[PDB]
Design an enzyme around this catalytic site. Structure first.
Site, PDB file in Angstrom:
ATOM      1  N   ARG A  54       0.707  -1.117  -0.093  1.00  0.00           N
ATOM      2  CA  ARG A  54       0.071   0.138  -0.043  1.00  0.00           C
ATOM      3  C   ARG A  54       1.052   1.126  -0.116  1.00  0.00           C
ATOM      4  NH1 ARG A  54      -4.182   3.007   3.900  1.00  0.00           N
ATOM      5  NH2 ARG A  54      -5.669   3.107   2.472  1.00  0.00           N
ATOM      6  N   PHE A  59       1.361  10.733   1.915  1.00  0.00           N
ATOM      7  CA  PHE A  59       0.688   9.953   2.921  1.00  0.00           C
ATOM      8  C   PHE A  59       1.489   9.069   3.450  1.00  0.00           C
ATOM      9  CE2 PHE A  59      -2.894   7.366   4.953  1.00  0.00           C
ATOM     10  CZ  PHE A  59      -2.482   7.732   6.463  1.00  0.00           C
ATOM     11  N   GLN A  62       3.246   1.631   3.117  1.00  0.00           N
ATOM     12  CA  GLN A  62       2.992   0.543   4.181  1.00  0.00           C
ATOM     13  C   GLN A  62       3.411  -0.797   3.776  1.00  0.00           C
ATOM     14  OE1 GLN A  62      -1.069   0.219   5.576  1.00  0.00           O
ATOM     15  NE2 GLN A  62      -0.789  -1.531   6.534  1.00  0.00           N
ATOM     16  N   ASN A 101      -1.865  -1.048  12.776  1.00  0.00           N
ATOM     17  CA  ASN A 101      -2.492  -2.065  13.685  1.00  0.00           C
ATOM     18  C   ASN A 101      -4.044  -1.897  13.305  1.00  0.00           C
ATOM     19  OD1 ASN A 101      -4.096   0.082  15.051  1.00  0.00           O
ATOM     20  ND2 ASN A 101      -2.304   0.787  15.944  1.00  0.00           N
ATOM     21  N   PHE A 112       4.384   1.581   8.918  1.00  0.00           N
ATOM     22  CA  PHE A 112       4.418   2.435   7.535  1.00  0.00           C
ATOM     23  C   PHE A 112       5.591   3.545   7.813  1.00  0.00           C
ATOM     24  CE2 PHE A 112       1.872   5.759   9.735  1.00  0.00           C
ATOM     25  CZ  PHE A 112       1.413   4.933  10.928  1.00  0.00           C
ATOM     26  N   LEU A 121      -2.730  10.355  13.776  1.00  0.00           N
ATOM     27  CA  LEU A 121      -2.120   9.009  14.168  1.00  0.00           C
ATOM     28  C   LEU A 121      -1.627   9.148  15.753  1.00  0.00           C
ATOM     29  CD1 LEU A 121      -1.030   7.751  10.865  1.00  0.00           C
ATOM     30  CD2 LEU A 121      -3.084   7.597  11.800  1.00  0.00           C
ATOM     31  N   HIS A 125      -0.996   4.986  17.094  1.00  0.00           N
ATOM     32  CA  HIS A 125      -0.058   4.349  16.620  1.00  0.00           C
ATOM     33  C   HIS A 125       1.417   4.501  17.087  1.00  0.00           C
ATOM     34  CE1 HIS A 125      -2.578   2.849  12.927  1.00  0.00           C
ATOM     35  NE2 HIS A 125      -3.108   3.946  13.464  1.00  0.00           N
TER      36      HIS A 125
END
Length: 163
Positions: A54, A59, A62, A101, A112, A121, A125
């Site tokens: 991903r 952004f 991942q 997660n 990521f 986040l 995270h």
């Protein structure tokens, strides 16, 4: 004293370059150790050969799903999941390394690399490292992503380990 680990990245099998990461073992030792050990393969499984499934430009990138290659798998060195260790460190900008997660206390192997500041986040995270060398290689990876995250070429961790 904090460990440094490297990923050698390939794009449809052609070498792209190397990224290295400092892991903040002084502040999140349990989370840092999971990533370190998965990078060396010393427990018999880990990241070598796995893909980044991903990638969303602007952004994050991942990866870390070395069992199902699509965001549904992975496992930690402690078992299938482990707890959120702490939230001392924040998502301050590009190059931050953080755990993916699926709810509280569900960390496995997926992570990521942020390519923007992702402050929403924070506290959800666990941040555990940063890019040290090769942020330019992360920027190059980003160009193979898309808005929905599907990559246009296969982005793989061709080799990895500890420096």
């Amino acid at each position: 004293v904090n460990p440094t680990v490297f990923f050698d990245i390939a794009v449809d099998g052609e070498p792209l370059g190397r990224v290295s990461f400092e892991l903040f073992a002084d502040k999140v030792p349990k989370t840092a150790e999971n990533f370190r050990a998965l990078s060396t393969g010393e427990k018999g499984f880990g990241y070598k050969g796995s893909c980044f499934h991903r990638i969303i430009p602007g952004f994050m990138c991942q990866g870390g799903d070395f069992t199902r290659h699509n965001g549904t798998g992975g496992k930690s060195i402690y078992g299938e999941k482990f707890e959120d260790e702490n939230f001392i460190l924040k998502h301050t900008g590009p190059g931050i390394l953080s755990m993916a997660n699926a709810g509280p206390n569900t960390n496995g192997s997926q992570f990521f690399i942020c390519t923007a500041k992702t402050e929403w986040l924070d506290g959800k995270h666990v941040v555990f490292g940063k890019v040290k060398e090769g942020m330019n290689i992360v920027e190059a990876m980003e160009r193979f992503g898309s808005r929905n995250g599907k990559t246009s070429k296969k982005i793989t961790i061709a080799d990895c380990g500890q420096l």
